[PDB]
Amino acid sequence: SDKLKEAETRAEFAERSVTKLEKSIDDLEDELYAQKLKYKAISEELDHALNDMTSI
Amino acid sequence: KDLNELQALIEAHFENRKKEEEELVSLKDRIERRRAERAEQQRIRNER
């Protein structure tokens, strides 16, 4: 009985940890996507600048 | 000719980093596919 209780508690702890880790990794992926979006926006602005500089 | 070669390499690395950004975008897309598939399979597991 003692061993079973220990195992059950370990399982609950690990499950909660996996839930937190999944949420955190999803949030960090969202943040990386946002920063990539900003980089792409300024890169397209610079590409337009280069297109005009082709006439420069 | 310095300006010419420099603008040439400028447009060149433009194109290269652009391909890399396309690859990274496709990576993000398959990543969101992975998020959705993990979400649905996790939800199925949790339902059962």
UniProtKB/Swiss-Prot annotation, chain A:
It is found in: Cytoplasm, Cytoskeleton. The modification Phosphoserine is found at residues 24, 43, 55. Phosphorylated at Ser-55 by DAPK1 in response to oxidative stress and this phosphorylation enhances stress fiber formation in endothelial cells. This is Tropomyosin alpha-1 chain. The sequences of cardiac and skeletal muscles are identical. It comes from the Eukaryota. The modification Phosphotyrosine is found at residue 33. Homodimer. Heterodimer of an alpha (TPM1, TPM3 or TPM4) and a beta (TPM2) chain. Interacts with HRG (via the HRR domain); the interaction contributes to the antiangiogenic properties of the histidine/proline-rich region (HRR) of HRG. Interacts (via N-terminus) with LMOD2 (via N-terminus) and TMOD1 (via N-terminus). Induction: Induced in stimulated quiescent cells. The gene is Tpm1. The molecule is in a coiled coil structure that is formed by 2 polypeptide chains. The sequence exhibits a prominent seven-residues periodicity. It comes from Mus musculus (Mouse). Binds to actin filaments in muscle and non-muscle cells. Plays a central role, in association with the troponin complex, in the calcium dependent regulation of vertebrate striated muscle contraction. Smooth muscle contraction is regulated by interaction with caldesmon. In non-muscle cells is implicated in stabilizing cytoskeleton actin filaments. Belongs to the tropomyosin family.
From Swiss-Prot, chain B:
Heart. The fetal heart shows a greater expression in the atrium than in the ventricle, while the adult heart shows a greater expression in the ventricle than in the atrium. Isoform 6 predominates in normal adult heart. Isoforms 1, 7 and 8 are expressed in fetal heart. Isoform 7 is also expressed in failing adult heart. It comes from the Eukaryota. It is linked to Cardiomyopathy, familial hypertrophic, 2: A hereditary heart disorder characterized by ventricular hypertrophy, which is usually asymmetric and often involves the interventricular septum. The symptoms include dyspnea, syncope, collapse, palpitations, and chest pain. They can be readily provoked by exercise. The disorder has inter- and intrafamilial variability ranging from benign to malignant forms with high risk of cardiac failure and sudden cardiac death. Troponin T is the tropomyosin-binding subunit of troponin, the thin filament regulatory complex which confers calcium-sensitivity to striated muscle actomyosin ATPase activity. Belongs to the troponin T family. This is Troponin T, cardiac muscle. It comes from Homo sapiens. The gene is TNNT2.
